[PDB]
Design an enzyme around this catalytic site. Structure first.
Site, PDB file in Angstrom:
ATOM      1  CG  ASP A 165      21.747  29.267 -22.938  1.00 33.78           C
ATOM      2  OD1 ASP A 165      22.373  29.058 -24.007  1.00 33.78           O
ATOM      3  OD2 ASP A 165      21.570  28.397 -22.001  1.00 33.78           O
ATOM      4  CD  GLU A 211      20.152  27.721 -29.799  1.00 30.05           C
ATOM      5  OE1 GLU A 211      21.195  28.362 -29.555  1.00 30.05           O
ATOM      6  OE2 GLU A 211      19.339  27.371 -28.910  1.00 30.05           O
TER       7      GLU A 211
HETATM    8  C1  LIG Z   1      25.460  19.393 -17.378  1.00 24.59           C
HETATM    9  C2  LIG Z   1      24.736  19.492 -18.709  1.00 24.59           C
HETATM   10  C3  LIG Z   1      25.110  20.785 -19.424  1.00 24.59           C
HETATM   11  C4  LIG Z   1      24.370  20.926 -20.745  1.00 24.59           C
HETATM   12  C5  LIG Z   1      23.105  21.774 -20.611  1.00 24.59           C
HETATM   13  C6  LIG Z   1      23.391  23.280 -20.478  1.00 24.59           C
HETATM   14  C7  LIG Z   1      22.055  24.010 -20.387  1.00 24.59           C
HETATM   15  C8  LIG Z   1      22.080  25.528 -20.501  1.00 24.59           C
HETATM   16  N1  LIG Z   1      22.866  25.977 -21.708  1.00 24.59           N
HETATM   17  C9  LIG Z   1      24.184  26.417 -21.200  1.00 24.59           C
HETATM   18  C10 LIG Z   1      24.802  27.402 -22.145  1.00 24.59           C
HETATM   19  O1  LIG Z   1      24.871  26.888 -23.486  1.00 24.59           O
HETATM   20  C11 LIG Z   1      23.884  26.964 -19.813  1.00 24.59           C
HETATM   21  O2  LIG Z   1      25.037  26.949 -18.961  1.00 24.59           O
HETATM   22  C12 LIG Z   1      22.702  26.168 -19.279  1.00 24.59           C
HETATM   23  O3  LIG Z   1      21.732  26.983 -18.595  1.00 24.59           O
END
Ligand SMILES: CCCCCCC[C@@H]1N[C@@H](CO)[C@H](O)[C@H]1O
Ligand SMILES: *[C@@H]1O[C@H](CO)[C@@H](O[C@@H]2O[C@H](CO)[C@@H](O[C@@H]3O[C@H](CO)[C@@H](O)[C@H](O)[C@@H]3O)[C@H](O)[C@H]2NC(C)=O)[C@H](O)[C@H]1NC(C)=O
Ligand SMILES: *[C@@H]1O[C@H](CO[C@@H]2O[C@@H](C)[C@@H](O)[C@@H](O)[C@@H]2O)[C@@H](O[C@@H]2O[C@H](CO)[C@@H](O)[C@H](O)[C@H]2NC(C)=O)[C@H](O)[C@H]1NC(C)=O
Ligand SMILES: *[C@@H]1O[C@H](CO)[C@@H](O[C@@H]2O[C@H](CO)[C@@H](O)[C@H](O)[C@H]2NC(C)=O)[C@H](O)[C@H]1NC(C)=O
Ligand SMILES: *[C@@H]1O[C@H](CO)[C@@H](O)[C@H](O)[C@H]1NC(C)=O
Ligand SMILES: *[C@@H]1O[C@H](CO)[C@@H](O)[C@H](O)[C@H]1NC(C)=O
Ligand SMILES: [Cl-]
Ligand SMILES: [Cl-]
Ligand SMILES: [Cl-]
EC number: 3.2.1.20
Length: 843
Positions: free
Chosen positions: A422, A425
C-alpha cells in the site's frame, strides 16, 4: 495561415494564460472559442523539426532532426536522432533521442504497417497496409523536444480510444478536449484526477473493427490531451520519445502484442482466486479469528484472511504488537492448519525516529544505504503511519537485498502467504519532506502537468531526491512497480512458491509481477458502477488480477449495495471485501438472512467456476489474453459493443450483466449475435436468449445477477468448499453450451496451484473438450500426475431440443440422466477421469 478548423487547433499556450499579443509574438494564431478548445494555437507553418539524412539500416531507418527556431520552452534540444525499427510484422518501434547526451530511459510475408515521413514539418506516418488507414500521423502538430518538455501529437483513426490508466472514467475516453494526467498519486478515486498508477498505452478502434495500440515508454509526469478532430498529444516532462505501435488487427491481438513488450501477466496461485476478507479495525488475533469462525458458521467460503495496520507495533513494518497480536504467529499457523492463507499490509516507508539499534529495518537500511537521499546525501524524511519515515530506493540493488532479508526474517516469525503493498506512490502526509524541497528546475519545472495540488511534490517526496538509477523526478511513476518487483523476488526467496503481491501504485508492465486493487473507493452505487470499466481497463493493460473493495472501502455500505457489489464483485478476477476503520461492518455474515443467501450464492458460483477462472489466468500468462474483457474485445466488428462498459465477459464465453443501481429488479444489457444460455439452468426467465445483436431487458431481482454462457463453449466446474484446499479435492463437471448445429469447445488447465516454473517443467495437465453430433469427448493435450486423477461426475448439456431415449458413457447406458423439456437441458451422471479419453453420447 490561421484558418484551422476549431477541432484541429493544437494549444500554443499549454504552459500559461496568454494574451493575444503574447500568442502572436510566439508565432501562433489567436482566435477565441465561440463558447477546452485552445484560443492560442499553432499555424501549419509553426517551426518544428526538419528531417535530414534519412538512411536505410538493417531492421529500419535512421535520420537527423533539426530545429532552427527555438520554442517558448527553455533548453530545446536543436539536434535529435530518429531511429525506426521494424521489429516484427505486428510491432513498429521508433525512438527520438539526443545524440550528444544520454537522457533518462525507463529501465504474403510483409508487415501489417507501412511507414513514411514528412520532411518539413517532420512527422512519422504509419498506415495499415491492408486498407490504407492512417493510424499515426505526427505531422499534425510541431515536435517539441526540450530538456523538461516533450510533445508528440497524432491524428486518431476514430473517436474510440481506451487506456492511459489510472483514472476513474468510462472505458472509452472522451475526445472532447480531455487532459489525462499520469503522476502516481494517493487520492480516493474521483473523475478528472491522477490516481495511484500510470500506464502510457492506448488502444484505438478503427471503422470495421480493426485496432492498433501505442505505447510511449516514458515514466515522467505527463499530460495526454485528446481533442475531437480526433487527435492526441503526448506531453512529457522528461526522458525521450520511445514509441511502439502494435498493428493488431484484432483488439485482443493489440493487447497480446503490447504484453509481448511489457510482459505477460504472472500466474497467481489458485488460492489467490478464492475470497479475501479484510478491514482496518480487526484489532486483535481474537477478533481476526472470529471473522473466520463467523464466515465458516454461515457457510461463506473464505480462502484468505487479511490484516491492515492493526497487527503492527506502532504502525511499523516487520513488527507485531504484544497486546492484541501477541500470539500472531500461532494465529497464522492455525489459519494454515484449516487450509486458508494469510495476507497483511506492508507500507514502503520505514520509521526513522526510533532509538538507534531498536528497529532493525531502519538500522540495517541506514547501514546498507537503502533509502532515497536528499541534497546533502542523508535520507529524505517524510511522514506516514509511524511518524517520521525514510523511503526505500527499490532501484538500488542493495535495497532489494535488504527488502528480501526483512521479508524473509519477518516470514520466519509469521508465515504470511503474500504482501499487500500500500501507500507506494510513494504517499507522503507532508509536502516533499520534513525539510521541504530545494528550489531547482526538477521541483519547479517549466511545464507542470494537471496533477492534483498543482505540484509534483503534493502528497509525495521531493522530485530532486536521489535514487540509484536517477532522480525521483524520472523514477516516481515506477516507485510502486519497483516495490512490486522487489516484493515478488522477496516472496519467491522466502517461500519457494508463486508470489502473491497486491499493489496500489502501478506502471506499465506491473502485471508481470503483481495484481492491483482500485484503492479507496466510496461505498456508493456510482463507485460500484465505475468499478466495471476500471477492472476491464486493467485487463487491457496486462493486470488481469484486479478488483475493487467489495461493498466499497470508504463510508458505510447499505445491505442492498453490498448484495449487488458481492454479486458483481464475485466476477472481479481479484475478489476482496475490504473496509475502513470508521465504517460499519460489511462481512457477508453481518447482513440479514436474505442478503446472506444472495451473497452465499455469489461466492458458491465463483468457487464452482474457479477451474475455468484459473484456465483463463493460464491463457493470460502464456498468450497475453485478458481474463475480464469488454464485449468489444470479443465482438469488435459489432460497433454496438464499442461503448459497453457496464457488462463484462470472463474470456470468450461468460457474459455478466450486473444491476448497478438501487431499487432495480431488472437490467438491460447488450447481447451480441448468437445464443446465450442462462447459467441458472446449470445445476450448482428465458432459458436461452436468441440474439441478432440487440439490447435485452432481463429480470434481476435482489437475489439475482444475470450470467449467460455463449453457445459453442464448454466450461469446467468443480464442487463446493469453504476453501480452495477443500474445493480442489471435489469432483468436477462440464457445462456444454451447444450451437444450433450441436457443436461446442472448451478446455481445462490444471497444475498443483502454487509451484514455480510449472510450464517450463511440464508439471500440468491440459485437456480440450469437444461437442459434435450428439457426442462429448476430451482431447488429451498433456497429462501428468497433477490433474490425471481429476474426477468428472456431471455433464450438463444446454440446447438439447428433444428428450434422448438413451445416454451412453463409454458405450454403456449411464446410471442416471434428467432431461427438462422446458429448459432444453440434459443433465448426465458419469464416473470419468479428465486425464483419460472418454466418449459421452445421446440420441
Ligand atoms: C478511515 C480513513 C481511511 C482512509 C485511509 C486509509 C489508509 C491506508 N490505505 C488503505 C488502502 O488504500 C489501507 O486500508 C490503510 O492502511
Ligand atoms: C536532508 O535530510 C536530513 C535528514 O536525513 C535533514 O536533516 C535535518 O536537518 C534539520 C536542520 O536543517 C534538523 O533540524 C534540527 O533539529 C534539531 C533537533 O534535532 C533542532 O535543535 C534544530 O533547531 C533543527 O530543527 C533535523 O533535526 C534533521 N533531521 C534529522 C532526522 O536529523 C536535512 O536538513 C536534509 N537536507 C536538506 C537540504 O533538505
Ligand atoms: C547530413 O550528412 C552530410 C554528409 O555527412 C557525411 O556523410 C554521412 C553518411 C556521414 O558519414 C557523415 O559522417 C559524413 O560527414 C553532412 O554534411 C557534411 O558535414 C560535414 C561536417 O559538418 C562536412 O565535413 C562535410 O563537408 C559535409 N558533407 C557534405 C557532402 O555536404 C550534413 O551536415 C548532415 N546534416 C545534418 C543536419 O547533420
Ligand atoms: C498527416 O498530417 C498532415 C498535416 O495535417 C497532412 O498534411 C496536410 O495535408 C493537407 C490536405 O492534403 C494539405 O493541404 C496540407 O498542406 C498538409 N500539411 C502539411 C504540413 O503537409 C497529411 O495529409 C497527413 N497525411 C496523411 C497520409 O494523412
Ligand atoms: C462474530 O459473530 C458473533 C456472534 O454473532 C459476534 O458477537 C462477533 O462480534 C462477530 N465477530 C466478528 C469479528 O465479526
Ligand atoms: C457510518 O455509520 C457510523 C455509525 O452511524 C457513523 O458514525 C459514521 O459517520 C458513518 N459514516 C458516514 C461517512 O456517514
Ligand atoms: Cl487578451
Ligand atoms: Cl538520469
Ligand atoms: Cl445500439
Amino acid at each position: 495561415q490561421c484558418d484551422v478548423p476549431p477541432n484541429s487547433r493544437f494549444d500554443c499556450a499549454p504552459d500559461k494564460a496568454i494574451t493575444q499579443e503574447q500568442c502572436e509574438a510566439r508565432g501562433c494564431c489567436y482566435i477565441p472559442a465561440k463558447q477546452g478548445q485552445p484560443w492560442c494555437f499553432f499555424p501549419p507553418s509553426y517551426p518544428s523539426y526538419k528531417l535530414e539524412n534519412l538512411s536505410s539500416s538493417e531492421m529500419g531507418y535512421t535520420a537527423t532532426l533539426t530545429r532552427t527556431t527555438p520554442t517558448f520552452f527553455p533548453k530545446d534540444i536543436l539536434t535529435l536522432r530518429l531511429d525506426v525499427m521494424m521489429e516484427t510484422e505486428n510491432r513498429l518501434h521508433f525512438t527520438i533521442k539526443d545524440p550528444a547526451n544520454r537522457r533518462y530511459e525507463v529501465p504474403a510475408p510483409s508487415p501489417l504497417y507501412s511507414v513514411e515521413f514528412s520532411e518539413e514539418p517532420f512527422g512519422v506516418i504509419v498506415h495499415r497496409q491492408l486498407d490504407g488507414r492512417v493510424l499515426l500521423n505526427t505531422t499534425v502538430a510541431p515536435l517539441f523536444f526540450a530538456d523538461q518538455f516533450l510533445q508528440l501529437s497524432t491524428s486518431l483513426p476514430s473517436q474510440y480510444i481506451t487506456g492511459l490508466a489510472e483514472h476513474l472514467s468510462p472505458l472509452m475516453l472522451s475526445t472532447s478536449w480531455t487532459r489525462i494526467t499520469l503522476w502516481n498519486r494517493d487520492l480516493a478515486p474521483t473523475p478528472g484526477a491522477n490516481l495511484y498508477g500510470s500506464h502510457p498505452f492506448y488502444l484505438a478502434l478503427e471503422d470495421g473493427g480493426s485496432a492498433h495500440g501505442v505505447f510511449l515508454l516514458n515514466s515522467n509526469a505527463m499530460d495526454v490531451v485528446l481533442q475531437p478532430s480526433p487527435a492526441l498529444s503526448w506531453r512529457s516532462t522528461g526522458g525521450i520519445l520511445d514509441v511502439y505501435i502494435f498493428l493488431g488487427p484484432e483488439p485482443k491481438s493489440v493487447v497480446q502484442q503490447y504484453l509481448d513488450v511489457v510482459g505477460y501477466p504472472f500466474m497467481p496461485p489458485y488460492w489467490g482466486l478464492g475470497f479475501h476478507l479484510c478491514r482496518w479495525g480487526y484489532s486483535s488475533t481474537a477478533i481476526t479469528r472470529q471473522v473466520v469462525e463467523n464466515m465458516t458458521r454461515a457457510h461463506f467460503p473464505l480462502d484468505v484472511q487479511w490484516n491492515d495496520l492493526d497487527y503492527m507495533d506502532s504502525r511499523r513494518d516487520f513488527t507485531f504488537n504484544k497486546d492484541g497480536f501477541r500470539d500472531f504467529p500461532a494465529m497464522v499457523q492455525e489459519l494454515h492448519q484449516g487450509g486458508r492463507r494469510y495476507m497483511m499490509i506492508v507500507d514502503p516507508a520505514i520509521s526513522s525516529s526510533g532509538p538507534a539499534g531498536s528497529y532493525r529495518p531502519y538500522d540495517e537500511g541506514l547501514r546498507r544505504g537503502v533509502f532515497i537521499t536528499n541534497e546533502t546525501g542523508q535520507p529524505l524524511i517524510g511522514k506516514v503511519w509511524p511518524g517520521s519515515t525514510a523511503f526505500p530506493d527499490f532501484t538500488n540493488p542493495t535495497a532489494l537485498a535488504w527488502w528480501e532479508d526483512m521479508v524473509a526474517e519477518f516470514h520466519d516469525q509469521v508465515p504470511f502467504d503474500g504482501m499487500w503493498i500500500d501507500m507506494n506512490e510513494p504517499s507522503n502526509f507532508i509536502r516533499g519532506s520534513e525539510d521541504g524541497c530545494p528550489n531547482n528546475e526538477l521541483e519547479n519545472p517549466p511545464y507542470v502537468p494537471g496533477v492534483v495540488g498543482g505540484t509534483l511534490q503534493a502528497a509525495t517526496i521531493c522530485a530532486s531526491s536521489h535514487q540509484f538509477l536517477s532522480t525521483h523526478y524520472n523514477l516516481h511513476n515506477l516507485y510502486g512497480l519497483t516495490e512490486a518487483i522487489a516484493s515478488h523476488r522477496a516472496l519467491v526467496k522466502a517461500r519457494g512458491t508463486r508470489p502473491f503481491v497486491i499493489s496500489r501504485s502501478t506502471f506499465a508492465g506491473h502485471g508481470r509481477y503483481a495484481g492491483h486493487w482500485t484503492g479507496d473507493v466510496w461505498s456508493s452505487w456510482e463507485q460500484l458502477a465505475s468499478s466495471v470499466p476500471e477492472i476491464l481497463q486493467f485487463n487491457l493493460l496486462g493486470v488481469p488480477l484486479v478488483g475493487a473493495d467489495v461493498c466499497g472501502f470508504l463510508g458505510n455500505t447499505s445491505e442492498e449495495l453490498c448484495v449487488r457489489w458481492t454479486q458483481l464483485g464475485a466476477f472481479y478476477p481479484f475478489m476482496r471485501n475490504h473496509n475502513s476503520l470508521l465504517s460499519l461492518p460489511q462481512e457477508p455474515y453481518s447482513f440479514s438472512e436474505p442478503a446472506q443467501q444472495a451473497m452465499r450464492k455469489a461466492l458458491t458460483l465463483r468457487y464452482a467456476l474457479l477451474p475455468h477462472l484459473y484456465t483463463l489466468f493460464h491463457q493470460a500468462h502464456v498468450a497475453g489474453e485478458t481474463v475480464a474483457r469488454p464485449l468489444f474485445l470479443e465482438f469488435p466488428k459489432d460497433s454496438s459493443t464499442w461503448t459497453v462498459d457496464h457488462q463484462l465477459l470472463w474470456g470468450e464465453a461468460l457474459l455478466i450483466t450486473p444491476v448497478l443501481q438501487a431499487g432495480k429488479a431488472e437490467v438491460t444489457g447488450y447481447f451480441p449475435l448468437g445464443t446465450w444460455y442462462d447459467l441458472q439452468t446449470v445445476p450448482i426467465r428465458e432459458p436461452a436468449i436468441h440474439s441478432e445483436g440487440q439490447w435485452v431487458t432481463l429480470p434481476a431481482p435482489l437475489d439475482t445477477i444475470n450470467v449467460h454462457l455463449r453457445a459453442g463453449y464448454i466450461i469446467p466446474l468443480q464442487g463446493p468448499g469453504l476453501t480452495t484446499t477443500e474445493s480442489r479435492q471435489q469432483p468436477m463437471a462440464l457445462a456444454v453450451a451447444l450451437t444450433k448445429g450441436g457443436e461446442a469447445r472448451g478446455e481445462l488447465f490444471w497444475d498443483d496451484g502454487e509451484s514455480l516454473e510449472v510450464l517450463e517443467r511440464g508439471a500440468y495437465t491440459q485437456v480440450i473438450f469437444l461437442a459434435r453430433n450428439n457426442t462429448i469427448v476430451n482431447e488429451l493435450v498433456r497429462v501428468t500426475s497433477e490433474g490425471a486423477g481429476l474426477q468428472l461426475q456431471k455433464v450438463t448439456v444446454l440446447g438439447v431440443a428433444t428428450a434422448p431415449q438413451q445416454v451412453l458413457s463409454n458405450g454403456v447406458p449411464v446410471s442416471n440422466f434428467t432431461y427438462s423439456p422446458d429448459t432444453k437441458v440434459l443433465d448426465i451422471c458419469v464416473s470419468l477421469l479428465m486425464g483419460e479419453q472418454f466418449l459421452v453420447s445421446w440420441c
